Amino acid sequence: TTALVCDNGSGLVKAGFAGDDAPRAVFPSIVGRPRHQGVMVGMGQKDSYVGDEAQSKRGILTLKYPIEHGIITNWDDMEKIWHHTFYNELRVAPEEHPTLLTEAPLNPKANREKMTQIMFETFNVPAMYVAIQAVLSLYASGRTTGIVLDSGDGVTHNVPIYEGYALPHAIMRLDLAGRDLTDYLMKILTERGYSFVTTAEREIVRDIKEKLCYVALDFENEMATAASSSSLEKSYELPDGQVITIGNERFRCPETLFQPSFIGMESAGIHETTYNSIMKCDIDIRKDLYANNVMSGGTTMYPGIADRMQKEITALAPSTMKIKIIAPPERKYSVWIGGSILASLSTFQQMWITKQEYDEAGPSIVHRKCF
Amino acid sequence: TTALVCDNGSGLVKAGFAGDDAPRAVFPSIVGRPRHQGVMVGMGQKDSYVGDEAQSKRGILTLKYPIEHGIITNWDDMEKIWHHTFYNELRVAPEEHPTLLTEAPLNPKANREKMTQIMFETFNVPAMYVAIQAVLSLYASGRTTGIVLDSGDGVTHNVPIYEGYALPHAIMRLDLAGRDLTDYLMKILTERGYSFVTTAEREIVRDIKEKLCYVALDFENEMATAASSSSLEKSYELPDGQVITIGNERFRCPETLFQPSFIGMESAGIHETTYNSIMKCDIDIRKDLYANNVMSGGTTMYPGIADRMQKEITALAPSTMKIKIIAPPERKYSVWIGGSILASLSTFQQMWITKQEYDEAGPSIVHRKCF
Amino acid sequence: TTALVCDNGSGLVKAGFAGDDAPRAVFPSIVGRPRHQGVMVGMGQKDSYVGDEAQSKRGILTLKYPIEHGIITNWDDMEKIWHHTFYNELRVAPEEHPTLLTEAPLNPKANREKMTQIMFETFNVPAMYVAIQAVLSLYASGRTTGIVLDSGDGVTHNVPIYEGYALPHAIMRLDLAGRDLTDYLMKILTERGYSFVTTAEREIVRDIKEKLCYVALDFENEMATAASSSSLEKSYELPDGQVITIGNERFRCPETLFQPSFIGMESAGIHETTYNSIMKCDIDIRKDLYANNVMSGGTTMYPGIADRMQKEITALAPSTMKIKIIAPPERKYSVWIGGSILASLSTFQQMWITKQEYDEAGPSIVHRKCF
Amino acid sequence: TTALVCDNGSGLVKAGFAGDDAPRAVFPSIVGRPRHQGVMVGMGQKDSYVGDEAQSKRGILTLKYPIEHGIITNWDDMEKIWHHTFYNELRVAPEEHPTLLTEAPLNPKANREKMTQIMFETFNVPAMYVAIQAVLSLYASGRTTGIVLDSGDGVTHNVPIYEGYALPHAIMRLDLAGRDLTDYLMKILTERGYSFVTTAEREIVRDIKEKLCYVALDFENEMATAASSSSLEKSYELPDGQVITIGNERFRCPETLFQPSFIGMESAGIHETTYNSIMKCDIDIRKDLYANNVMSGGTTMYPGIADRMQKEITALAPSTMKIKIIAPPERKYSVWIGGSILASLSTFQQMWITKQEYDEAGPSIVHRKCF
Amino acid sequence: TTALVCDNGSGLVKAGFAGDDAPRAVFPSIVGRPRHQGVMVGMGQKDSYVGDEAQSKRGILTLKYPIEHGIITNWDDMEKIWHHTFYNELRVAPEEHPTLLTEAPLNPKANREKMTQIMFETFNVPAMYVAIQAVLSLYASGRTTGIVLDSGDGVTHNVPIYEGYALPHAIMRLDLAGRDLTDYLMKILTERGYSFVTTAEREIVRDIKEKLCYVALDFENEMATAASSSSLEKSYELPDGQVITIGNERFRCPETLFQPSFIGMESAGIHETTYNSIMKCDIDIRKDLYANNVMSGGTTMYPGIADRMQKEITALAPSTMKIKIIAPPERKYSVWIGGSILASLSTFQQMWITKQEYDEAGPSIVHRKCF
């Protein structure tokens, strides 16, 4: 049967069938519950909503993400999300289809173990596999050598790979991503008098961020330009028809990727983390890593982020090293695309964790068979 | 057995059987007692009259409303009114029929408790329920989303509802309604020399208000027009054949709904209260609330009130928000119609307060089972 | 035992038994005493005569009415009249029969008190009651709603009643009646040279008034007609065979009912008093009062008085109000007829003032039990 | 020039010059016309009399009040009264003197308009102003906070004022005053056999009321005392030397102020109206209103009325609220005194309606410039 | 010269001279305007009132707070309030005195900019500074380490400070404070039939809240106790002498601080917000933050709030962490006291924004010099 691929990200579920070129089910990994008084009977209204229904009814619901920082924190809501993905979005019987899952590196192993247990015992899949997202992204690029910067929401991580060999000691992880950016934007929007507090307003601010925010090539020059003139100001219409105008916040928001101190984090910026990951690697592969910086994830979709990244890594790296940033279109889905490629490889069909192997070894099997 | 529905309003009793499309008993919630010397014996004249008999004999009686501002203030007369409703108007035995009652929101809970106690112990109904009028009105509209402006006499209230969920913190109540309008009309009619003092004359003035008063689309322009010409003047014939002519009073009377200061109230107008109720609600539902302003009650029957309301809420709300006022015909009875729909719903048959539950918990049960 | 009914009017005693359709004793409430020298002995002639004997012997007697303006002014002669009524006319023992008396409204209460005392202590009746004449007249009409214009001699009064309830504040009394008319006719008859001075001549003039006088529909037109031609002149034969011819005096006499200024009174006419009584009443009952103007008493027996009254009240009342004058035949006796009906009502048998109650409370009891 | 002040009351004209401490012209607002045959020529007798001449000649005249219930009903006689006031009593040329008039609240605006027109076009005054009587009374008290009970004849009204701000929505008016009391006394005097019918006899009864009537502190106890003993009976000598004795009528007459039902009115008593006026006002000012109940007008001059009022308002108001009744001597004239104070204020000289403003705007100007 | 300190809170102005131990001017930051008809001239009454005069005359005024949620929304009324503070309360010339102002964190920067502009251009102060209130409160405690919970009306905020260093990323703000509590109390008081609608009645309800409300140590146990017995019921006397009895409302009102859902807010309670602020901070300082929870503001003055806070934070925090709540007396004024200490520090005299610096850089200077 055709394998399932579910890139169960912190913010969005990307799910589909292996061999397809894009996921057919993309929806927020969010579960919503009503927070207000139900007064009208006979309406068949439910006590829990998931995905696009939660977004549509968000004004009446409290929205909660069961996965935070790439770590599943609410297993009942995660099970509800997976059940939705299988039965309502894909409209498939999971017991027929091998399912390829994925997770960020340096994650708690109990998360992987419980994922395997739920997949095998609740949804009764015949086979399962858990891949590291950056490896799938590198699969999607068609390459075998490169350092992948994957950044969705929740977690940002770098994985250097050379000739198909990963350097796990050089893997670097940063718990700073699109959700932290959304929260920071909510914070700084208070400077202009716009107050966004609720989770639905957090979704509104996320939409604002996606639509209007961009990465400054030179942060101080852009700040001076915004102080000088209104040329950078943009207007956004709220769901109730109220219009807000956003200025330097547009690039101050993503700047926290390069200056995590804006949100009080001591961590080095994304560029310095990439450079340090490269420098932890053997000297001989660094040139090829410099030329194959692969960007992945939704938070790499900010306009100008590739140019800024190239500039900073060029400033860090020795002269005459050829810094190249590969930021292809549709890199939002590169993890899922690589998962589809991998799951459809003939050589991969022996890598699956089978129901038999799980019945023998239990959920510990993932630590043996999965990277 | 078929459930009874009694919309026990401050001015009118609307009563009937669930499943019917209209109440079969509509009469004033008024009790009249003779105020003059009874000289002729053998006439079988009674010491108390209720409803239409009180209206017909009003010239000899003192008329009193047992319910004021949606609050029952005279429980003996209210009991007499309910007894009339059951035995003389509906001609039914209340002990056979579940009775759905209703009341305005933010009412004293002792009123609901005493209502339940009287229903269960005096009329010995098998089951009872107390619904909020605006929810019933929304039921009558066939909708599940909207902000209901209900205005009879005694109380005006707004209840926002989205997807069947009420926002009680956004519920707004205004103790300004048709009875205050009737009193104000009585006051301003003195300007032309017409003196109405007695309760029967208050009923006469109420009839004048119902027949001739209307809402100006632009109050100052209408005032200028009335000063300029007699085109707006209308004549009304009193019961004794005396003819009175009414001019700008026609629209000054209902204008107090939009300018409560005319009667010394500090409250904002009906339109500003609706807008504030909307703005207290979550930003995401405001658009749908703007499009589903449902008008209910007799005091929403003034000609032009819907257009005025749309104009004012459009002036308040952001541009490009689609303000729509749903003022259907027969909105006098929308509360009762919704009560009939609700009482006849299969899913509602478990919501009833049973005589058993009352015998266990006492009159406090309504606070648990009723919204 | 069968109750007695005595309509003790100022001019005529109307007495009989309750349940009968007419009084069997009708005679003038007059006491006559000889004013001339008694020369023949052995004749058994009496020193006092009452009623029809006084009328027959009037030429030798001085005639005095013990009741003036509805007020008993000579209690010894009133006692003689009552004794005559009981023992000689009805030929009954008063101690066996409850006696219903009546009086005009707004009378001195001492008159009622002394009446009660005389009835209980002199004639020793077992029970007694004092009714207001207009209420009895309304009883006789078979109605329960209407404004009664009662006019005998002595007093004219209006009592509005609606649904059995009297409006005492709207009760109006006018001390202008048939005796004032008789005196005015005596005055104006001097214009043609006819001098009537004595009390017996006053009785003659009363007979002239009763037989020949009428109410002009339009007073000025009738005056012009009488000036133009003799068509309106009528002849009357005096007891001594002298013939007198009467012209415009025929309608000038009763015109004083509508123009009391003819006798120097400042009071408004009978029609204006009826209208003012109606207008003092609640607006809601005025229409029914307009349609139920009940005329009662001997001075309402003038030909054309009903048409004149309808014309004037129509001129006063608003157009489209249906003015109706109920002037039934035998309205001379309507007060007595109503008294008979009332006294024979089963529900009235508890209204009697008993000898026991009088022995307890004294003559003050009437103010408590009687309207 | 010195301003004129004319408190044109329903019963009495109080007129004088601003700055004086009392009106120099006090006379009845009454016009008398002869009702009898003028037989003697060469006597120079007039066809119309006004004020004190009408009172002196009242026995020959029909007396009419051109103002009823505070409303001018006969403008020709009102013009005659004003002409008398100006030319014969004050002996002044009105075209030289600004004239401050006053009227009861909630009066027909046409009355004020016609007053202004007559003042400006007939008497050609240079300036005019119409003040509300209770405000002037409060001016006379020297206060700026209080609820004024003004009661002359025709109209009784309450005006609450706090810190110079009136609460017009709490203004209450009652068309029950000294003339209704005089009529009721005329009615009940018939109980003792005293008949007063004519307008001159109405003036006699008014004098009786003023001299002998008083307010019972406890009505039922006084009734029992009057029934028990003659101690409360008083004698009054009529103009013809006839002596009448009055008993409980003395306090039954003014009791109608507290029990309007005695004359068939449905209205609450004077005390309940004052309390309701207070309770219609903002909670924060009620304490100061309770302590500053100002009594004004001739019908507040009954002995004991202040004590009765204090007792009743104390019975109504919460305990520990300090009820105080300010009933100063000469409160008959407090309205005029306040008018004099106001008219002589420097700050008021801009409030006048000038002949120029009237020539521009016409009689409508009063509705703009006058409260 | 001595520096001025003005803690311009949302509800109360606390103003005084630096170096003093308490503010000498404490009055409500409220501006009142008359809403009723001014009828009495010559009284010198003003069109606007501020502070204690507005409170005293509140029954005639409409009261408006120019600052809402710590944000100045009406700059003209705020200017009037500051002018009052300087000239009438402190009776000082502001151009002579450096003025230290303060505001809540995460406020719009335009509010601070306009404050600076008004201070420098309208009141022409020589120097100015804007401090964050919680830092001043920590100054008042004498500490340099701690997490300050400041709650007046309008805004509640937490600021963690360690060794004089603030963690702005851990600063948390909640727009739920005493005014929301007052509104909620007004809402729930309707359950017992007490209706408070007007702004003056809102002030009455605020006084009720301050006097009678308290924080339950265990909310459900207190609810059960209130249901069981009247022991918790308290009586309050309204200004008009009406007495109201309050029961479980006493602790339901402040419970909304711990359960914001009572007013429909999605926010976590005050205790959970404090814990989350601590947990956002570096692990090493959390122990000292746990031991130095400083409570500030008027809404921290509820009896039992400190014990409840300690209980909840102990329930949240790990065992053996020493939770300590520092709720000193006079914490109403701790912000002002700290401002006085800071303004009187020698080292602070270089921190002032001078008129020179403002004339150079304009109102943007505050963003540079002020935290």
Ligand SMILES: Nc1ncnc2c1ncn2[C@@H]1O[C@H](COP(=O)(O)OP(=O)(O)O)[C@@H](O)[C@H]1O
């Ligand atoms: N055009 C855009 N610009 C900036 N950020 C974006 C854009 N589109 C999506 N994002 C961000 O990408 C994140 C989701 O990326 P995704 O790869 O789905 O992460 P995950 O794998 O954790 O679900 C969201 O936090 C969203 O705000």
Ligand SMILES: Nc1ncnc2c1ncn2[C@@H]1O[C@H](COP(=O)(O)OP(=O)(O)O)[C@@H](O)[C@H]1O
């Ligand atoms: N055509 C009309 N125009 C204006 N007002 C009306 C009209 N018909 C009824 N009303 C008013 O509606 C009120 C009664 O409405 P209703 O919904 O019965 O209120 P309740 O539920 O309190 O009885 C009355 O006060 C009446 O004056």
Ligand SMILES: Nc1ncnc2c1ncn2[C@@H]1O[C@H](COP(=O)(O)OP(=O)(O)O)[C@@H](O)[C@H]1O
């Ligand atoms: N046909 C008539 N036309 C005019 N007047 C009449 C007629 N018959 C009787 N009357 C008058 O009616 C009066 C008696 O009416 P009555 O009802 O007996 O009065 P009372 O009740 O006072 O006795 C007399 O004054 C008499 O003149």
Ligand SMILES: Nc1ncnc2c1ncn2[C@@H]1O[C@H](COP(=O)(O)OP(=O)(O)O)[C@@H](O)[C@H]1O
């Ligand atoms: N001593 C008194 N006792 C009772 N009533 C009085 C007394 N003096 C005057 N009145 C009444 O006061 C009324 C006149 O009061 P006034 O203030 O002149 O009224 P207005 O302003 O309408 O003329 C009269 O009706 C009179 O009967």
Ligand SMILES: Nc1ncnc2c1ncn2[C@@H]1O[C@H](COP(=O)(O)OP(=O)(O)O)[C@@H](O)[C@H]1O
């Ligand atoms: N004893 C008390 N109990 C409860 N609340 C109080 C008490 N005293 C004052 N308050 C509340 O504190 C608030 C004012 O506190 P304050 O520190 O002045 O706030 P701000 O700084 O915003 O003016 C008011 O909303 C008031 O209701």
Ligand SMILES: [Mg+2]
């Ligand atoms: Mg991702």
Ligand SMILES: [Mg+2]
């Ligand atoms: Mg209704």
Ligand SMILES: [Mg+2]
């Ligand atoms: Mg008769």
Ligand SMILES: [Mg+2]
């Ligand atoms: Mg007066």
Ligand SMILES: [Mg+2]
């Ligand atoms: Mg504060």
